[PDB]
Amino acid sequence: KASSFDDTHKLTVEKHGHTALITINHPPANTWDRDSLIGLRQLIEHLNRDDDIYALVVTGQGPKFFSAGADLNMFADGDKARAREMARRFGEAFEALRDFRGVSIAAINGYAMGGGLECALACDIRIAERQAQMALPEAAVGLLPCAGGTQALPWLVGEGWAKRMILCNERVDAETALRIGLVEQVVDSGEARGAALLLAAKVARQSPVAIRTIKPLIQGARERAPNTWLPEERERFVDLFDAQDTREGVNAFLEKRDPKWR
Amino acid sequence: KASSFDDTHKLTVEKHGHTALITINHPPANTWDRDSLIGLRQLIEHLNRDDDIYALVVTGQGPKFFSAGADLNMFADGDKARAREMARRFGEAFEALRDFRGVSIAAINGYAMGGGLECALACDIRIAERQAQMALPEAAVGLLPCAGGTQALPWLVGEGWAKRMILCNERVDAETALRIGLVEQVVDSGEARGAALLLAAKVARQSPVAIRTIKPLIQGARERAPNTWLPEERERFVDLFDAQDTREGVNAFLEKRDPKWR
Amino acid sequence: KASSFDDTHKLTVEKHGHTALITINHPPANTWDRDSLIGLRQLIEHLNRDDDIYALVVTGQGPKFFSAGADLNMFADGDKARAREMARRFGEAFEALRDFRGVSIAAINGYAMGGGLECALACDIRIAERQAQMALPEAAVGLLPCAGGTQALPWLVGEGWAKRMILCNERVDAETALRIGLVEQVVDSGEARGAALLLAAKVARQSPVAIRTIKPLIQGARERAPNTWLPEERERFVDLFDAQDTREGVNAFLEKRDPKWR
Amino acid sequence: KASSFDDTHKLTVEKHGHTALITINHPPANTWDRDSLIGLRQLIEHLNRDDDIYALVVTGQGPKFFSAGADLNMFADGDKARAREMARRFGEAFEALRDFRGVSIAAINGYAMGGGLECALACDIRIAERQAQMALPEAAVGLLPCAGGTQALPWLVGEGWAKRMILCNERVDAETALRIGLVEQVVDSGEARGAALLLAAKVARQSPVAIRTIKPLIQGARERAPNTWLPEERERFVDLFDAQDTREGVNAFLEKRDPKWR
Amino acid sequence: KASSFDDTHKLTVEKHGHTALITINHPPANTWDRDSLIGLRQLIEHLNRDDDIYALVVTGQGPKFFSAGADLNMFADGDKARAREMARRFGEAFEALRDFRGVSIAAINGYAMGGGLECALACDIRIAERQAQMALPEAAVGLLPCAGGTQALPWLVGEGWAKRMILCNERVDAETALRIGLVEQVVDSGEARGAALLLAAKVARQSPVAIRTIKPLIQGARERAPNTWLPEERERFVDLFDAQDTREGVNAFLEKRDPKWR
Amino acid sequence: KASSFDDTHKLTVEKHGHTALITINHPPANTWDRDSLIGLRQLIEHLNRDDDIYALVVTGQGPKFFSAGADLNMFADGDKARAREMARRFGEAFEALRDFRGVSIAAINGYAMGGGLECALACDIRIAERQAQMALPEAAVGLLPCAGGTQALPWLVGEGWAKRMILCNERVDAETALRIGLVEQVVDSGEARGAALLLAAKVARQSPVAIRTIKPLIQGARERAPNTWLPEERERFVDLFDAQDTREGVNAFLEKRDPKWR
């Protein structure tokens, strides 16, 4: 995946099966920068066009930190324009990732804070090593999360838990995050990458055309009320049926055999 | 309850006190069929009209399946017209149950998957035995949940967990479900029905007229933003107050005695 | 603050640092009254105007109850005109606290149900003693929660749990509440007030200008879908950057010193 | 319809063909009364139950007043309970009128002001005699339109014109209202009833089942954004097709003969 | 445009300058067909890709019919599947037209009824010859408009006028449509095509990049409340500003010369 | 008002009765500038505090220009920072005018283009001189309207007419504007101010408390769908009833005499 295009060397992409592995490679904290943000949005676009990929996994280079958030240089003083433009880039990149047609899993191999946590929130599922600590510390410096942190964090864990981290600037351990629902699963140190890939391989096992259409329905509630999507849900359901791939899944279950699709 | 109209033998309703008990009776997996869906909507309409019933309980016949989901014959390939119509049936049927004036409790005594889970999601409160496992496997066959699963599950348990079950096709034990908020309470095997009837009997102890009005307000957020409903809440409260029944519930508390209403 | 106006002696406010302490002092159950509701709304308005206060704490006088809910004298039969007016007073008072620019922490040192629970829900963060029990018992007497309870409780804990407390009239201990996400933290008896003050101290360490702007974004989901707020989230961020205060927060981290603002 | 039920003599119902004619009979100004409000809501429900009536027409007794608006008796000082209760009936009454399944035609034969204009707004279509003048004068007396005027008037004619009438208390002649979209058609004096009845006969020519389903869709925008209803529009369309009546209408045009349905 | 593409022979594409001319050519009433609808969607997508096109015009072949809507063979009885599929096609095609990045001008040279009217509505601007009559007659055959007509018509003309056309099956002349706002301009017979091309040329005089971004904003209200879109309007404005194309327009007004962009 | 407040020389405020007259005083074109934008927002705020003001009128100094739109220097190339900040002031300033509790009347005394038209749209009612021409030309310059013009214009005149002005860069005379609903009234040259003030004298005749509360209801549809506001409309009605001023207006009509309030 993404074998032919101008992509920052800071982001390295390795394709495993139908899963594309994206690693932030910025030393020493894997801090986000304008070059990586541009690459990510572009990468997501390229990966979406590719039909051979059904899942994506994001992890931080190095053991210590998945992502330290935004690099200090981006917010260097004396330029108002810079802050504006860069808020744009986080939103575009993270929303693109949030909009990846395939399943996205974030393997938190180190502590995720600020932009780093916002990136993980973009991914559909989060898997974290026990030692990682996740928090939004922007409030301490007088900046809000501008990557969608304000919306995303309450959504998963509720407003009260979201408020303590951003408002009170309190970091949470993996055990806490799993308890509040921030992270779906907890893993032993260093196992986040393998578990994510292992899970991403399971995603390859579901119909590609189906996964791509179902994911918007799940995330529809963000745009609009859930009851409104109900007519569309049946309609999308009818569209699937009008596919070669659809008939294969039902037949396979009927005959007790593994489904095979294109 | 539902003593005489043409009701499918597949669905049997027995009346205990003020609670109507509905059980799927389809062998061997209790899988849903077109006839059951029609009856369920009709049963809900008839139940709403009856004023002697304050609570509803649905369980799966036998100790192995609350519900197996949709029957394969119903989705047998590959006629597109049928598919459109069965999804329509699910939506109306599940929505009708979701909109029941009285409280709806689903007692999970068996495997509840696909359509069955969606049905359980339709119920206000879910009680599950420790052994039961719930998941949405429609993505594996290339079919989406058309019963409101795409909305209902993320609402109850959050997006991250919901995607994992549907997108990753990952079943959940009773313990995970209670932890993620999917199920309100966990019970020993075979005790779901007894627990369901027991919880339903307490609901009959609250004002009938109140219960029907209060349920819409709670489910208001799905149609629209919560804050929009605040004016309506006060207006519905006063509508409750201009009733003979409301004066009785308050009086009982003052005199420290059980309230008595029609 | 709030020592120079007419404020009911039932509500006592103590100013500690940048935290304002609000105590309900109505014996014996700390039940809400018209005099308290008016003071609360006025109090919140004065507190917002004050620039020395960054956090708010509310606690119930006495060990046994944080708040009893609404006073019985407040809902005596059979007058409807008042009932309409009292319900209005709750909404006005509760929304004012909910929209307090600073962080609001509710310390639950006693049983908090009905109106009292509704009050805690308005607060940003809730800390509860192990013994405290919280429920909405209005349905049993035929009254719906009029303080925004129908919206606030499902939002934090989800519909299934929320329906149980109101519809089924079931009380929850601190432990269940922490599990369901109703309370962010559980504390040893008598320590909630001290812990809340301590947590309130953490809020002082974050930039005031940031906290006030940031708080609306997190609560944006209630008024509208979260995705709608994303362009605003970037816009408000640029506004924060256009200040003398914001540059101090970022610069302090680079040189790893505590931020100093006014 | 309304042949054998307890209805106020102030309101008279005449059944012509498939249209039921309802006339306000309050002397001398045809002002609304509690008896009128109750009868209206009760009547509308009854009309909705009757399948023989596909259209509705509303007219004001006497040549001079279509609807005097609210009676002073209702808002007579100084009881507060009276006002809250009475606003409730207008909302219930008009909304029921607004929600009539068959078409509602408002024939303006006389002065329509205050509640009367609000009533006409509830009607789907308005036909007015050239002489009649309509405005909302409640602001002059310190009362807002509580019948939905604040929403309804702006929707039809725009914010600028609506504010002018309500905020500036400016009455409009038939010609001006037609120019602004307040009234779809203008008729010579005394021809409103005939034109409204005659327009109502045309509606019977359209499929009753189609008509009842289509009207909510048109009115969907008031509850939610237009685009949101698009999936459901297709769904209800297919629902029409699975009906004996649809096949006849579709068939009738092809033969070039008038459709015949029940 | 679109010469090296497979489009139904019925749809004719002519390129004048930056304006692409599409003519429906289905005899004898220019009624829509499945072959036509897919091409239309496809044609729009190809047009969106081409940067050489800034405007779009659609007119009906021959003087007599702009567009007759859906053919009966398309809706021929008795299969339900046929109708579900065609309803999807109208929505997809018309929504694609509505989403054309460039301005779409509808030139009404003939009868526009049913789908044809819906097609016109999908266009941004409508220019009609005095003789053309536009109505929705689907209700007379018992079928609602499935092309988004139920939403599109009340949006342009208001509910009251919209209801009469759909509910009462009333056709409107060019003058009446102009008065009600259905058509922006009325033209002499046979001048609709020339006028549309001439109008389309004027759009070329505004910045292409600006036009594509601005057009969604105007249509934002359909998705959401207008007030929600304002922060985004400011954001997109800044995005436009960060481009060479924007600097040219400002320069042109300053020196009083015509703006020149790619 | 603005008796003792810090305002730029460029806005002139004269108090006539209960109407505050605000005139843009920028030569030669009355073009908007950063200094005026701030004054506008502050002036609106101050006008809001004064209880002696019930109406607002905005006009441009000189006969020829109500407003030239935005000043060229503020949007001068090429700093991205300047443009972002300038867009921000337009929104704050215009929304403030939009949010004035008292009625706002725009007297179009001269050419109103770009910002000027957007400024006029913020006003509740627009009165224009026959010779005045209004258009949005920003698209010709490659800039979108950042003053909410994209939202405001289609709301008043509809999308179709809105698109031609902005997308086709076409200017409209008063007869055209009046016809399309852009302006409520057309006036003879030079009488706009007198007519505006005269119309502003009318609002003084209506209860001040009702006007301030009623105006948000009319404008509630912009934030959210209209049916949502109906419960609140009833609630606000009841709040007005709980006021001394409300009783006075109703009495005057009963006694057929002029209402008198403070």
Residue numbers in the entry:
A (entry chain D), B (entry chain F), C (entry chain E), D (entry chain C), E (entry chain A), F (entry chain B): 9 to 270
Sentences from the paper on this structure:
In P. aeruginosa, the gene PA0745 encodes a putative crotonase, named dspI, which has been shown to be responsible for the CDA biosynthesis. The structural studies confirmed the catalytic features of DspI as an enoyl-coenzyme A (CoA) hydratase that catalyzes the dehydration of 3-hydroxydecanoyl-CoA during CDA synthesis. DspI is a α/β protein composed of six perpendicular antiparallel β-strands surrounded by eleven α-helices. It can be divided into two domains: the N-terminal spiral domain (α1–α8 and β1–β6) and the C-terminal trimerization domain (α9-end).
The proteins were crystallized in two different space groups. The P31 form has six molecules and the P6322 form has only one molecule per asymmetric units. The atomic coordinates from the two space groups were refined at a resolution of 2.10 Å and 2.25 Å. In both crystal forms, the first eight residues have not been modeled because of the poor density in this region. The C-terminal segment (residue 252–272) is further missing in the P6322 form. Thus, the structure of the P31 form is used for most of the descriptions in this study, unless otherwise specified. Hexamer organizations could be generated by applying the symmetry operations in both crystal forms. The hexamer is a dimer of two stacked trimers and each subunit possesses the canonical crotonase fold. In DspI, the C-terminal residue 252–272 (average B factor 73.54 Å2) is more flexible than the remainder of the trimerization domain (average B factor 41.71 Å2). It protrudes away from its own subunit and covers the neighboring monomer within the same trimer.
